[PDB]
Amino acid sequence: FTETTIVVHYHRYDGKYDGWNLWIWPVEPVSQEGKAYQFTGEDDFGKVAVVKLPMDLTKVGIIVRLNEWQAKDVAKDRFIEIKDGKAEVWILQGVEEIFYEKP
Amino acid sequence: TETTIVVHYHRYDGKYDGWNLWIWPVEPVSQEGKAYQFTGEDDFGKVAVVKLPMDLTKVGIIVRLNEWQAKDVAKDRFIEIKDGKAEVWILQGVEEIFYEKP
Ligand SMILES: OC[C@H]1O[C@H](OC[C@H]2O[C@H](O[C@H]3[C@H](O)[C@@H](O)[C@@H](O[C@H]4[C@H](O)[C@@H](O)[C@@H](O)O[C@@H]4CO)O[C@@H]3CO)[C@H](O)[C@@H](O)[C@@H]2O)[C@H](O)[C@@H](O)[C@@H]1O
Numbered sequence: 001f002t003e004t005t006i007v008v009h010y011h012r013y014d015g016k017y018d019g020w021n022l023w024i025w026p027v028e029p030v031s032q033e034g035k036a037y038q039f040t041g042e043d044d045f046g047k048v049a050v051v052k053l054p055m056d057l058t059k060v061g062i063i064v065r066l067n068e069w070q071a072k073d074v075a076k077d078r079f080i081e082i083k084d085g086k087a088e089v090w091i092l093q094g095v096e097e098i099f100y101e102k103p
Numbered sequence: 104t105e106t107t108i109v110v111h112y113h114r115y116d117g118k119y120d121g122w123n124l125w126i127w128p129v130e131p132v133s134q135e136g137k138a139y140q141f142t143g144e145d146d147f148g149k150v151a152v153v154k155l156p157m158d159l160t161k162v163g164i165i166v167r168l169n170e171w172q173a174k175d176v177a178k179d180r181f182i183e184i185k186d187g188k189a190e191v192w193i194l195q196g197v198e199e200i201f202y203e204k205p
C-alpha cells in the first residue's frame with residue numbers, strides 16, 4: 001500500500017547505454033514532478049532499471065533521456081499503467097509503444 | 104511495372120543466420136510468394152532489397168527462419184507500397200512494421 005516498483009527494460013540498437021537514464025514522474029493517484037533513475041542491471045535485451053517509489057501509484061510518466069536532457073529517446077511524454085504497486089515494461093529505442101511483455 | 108521494397112530487420116540477439124523474408128503480392132493481385140534473402144547490412148541490422156516486376160500497392164510479409172523452421176511474428180503482415188517503393192523497419196517480436204528508422 002505504500003510502495004511501487006517498476007522494472008524497466010531498455011534496448012538500443014548499438015548496445016551503448018552509457019549515460020542513458022529514466023525520468024519518471026507520478027501521475028495517478030497523486031501527481032508530482034519527476035526524478036531521474038539509473039539502470040541497475042543488464043540482461044539479454046539490454047539494460048534493466050528497478051525503480052522504487054515510496055507511494056502506491058497506478059500511473060507514472062516516463063521519458064528515456066541521455067544524462068541531464070542532452071537528448072530524449074522518443075521525445076513525447078509516455079506513461080506506464082501499474083496494478084498492485086508493480087509493473088514491468090520493455091522499451092525499444094525510437095519505438096513509441098511501451099510493451100508489457102518481452103518482444 | 105516494378106515494385107522495390109527495402110526491408111531493415113533487427114534482432115536483439117544479433118544472430119541473423121538463416122532468417123529470410125517470405126513476400127507475396129496482395130494488391131492489385133494476390134499470388135503465391137517467394138523467399139527473399141538479406142542482401143546487406145547497416146547499423147540497425149540486416150537489409151533486403153526486394154524487387155517484384157509488378158505494379159503493386161500492397162504485399163504480404165512473414166519473417167521466417169530457413170524453410171519455415173520458425174516465424175518471427177506468426178501472423179500475416181503487410182507493407183503498403185507508395186509510388187512503387189517501400190522502405191520499412193521490422194523488429195524481432197514487434198508486430199508493427201515501421202516506415203521510418205526507429
Ligand atoms: O505546477 C506545479 C505542479 O508540480 C507538479 O507537476 C509538474 C508537472 O508535471 C508534469 O510534467 C512532466 C512533463 O510533462 C514531462 O515532459 C517532463 O518534463 C521534462 C521535460 O520533458 C524536459 O524536456 C525538461 O524540460 O525537463 C522537464 C522536467 O523538469 O517531466 C515533467 C514532470 O517532472 C505535468 O505533465 C505538468 O503538467 C506539470 O506541470 C505536480 O504534479 C502538479 O500537481 C503541480 O501543479
Ligand SMILES: OC[C@H]1O[C@H](O[C@H]2[C@H](O)[C@@H](O)[C@@H](O[C@H]3[C@H](O)[C@@H](O)[C@@H](O)O[C@@H]3CO)O[C@@H]2CO)[C@H](O)[C@@H](O)[C@@H]1O
Binds near residue numbers: 133134135137
Ligand atoms: O494462392 C496462394 C495463397 O496466397 C496467399 O497466401 C499466403 C498466406 O496467407 C501466407 O501465410 C503465406 O503462407 C505460407 C505460410 O504462412 C507458411 O506457414 C507455409 O505454410 O508456407 C506458406 C507459403 O507456401 O504466404 C502465402 C502466399 O505464398 C493468400 O492469403 C491465400 O489465400 C492464397 O491461397
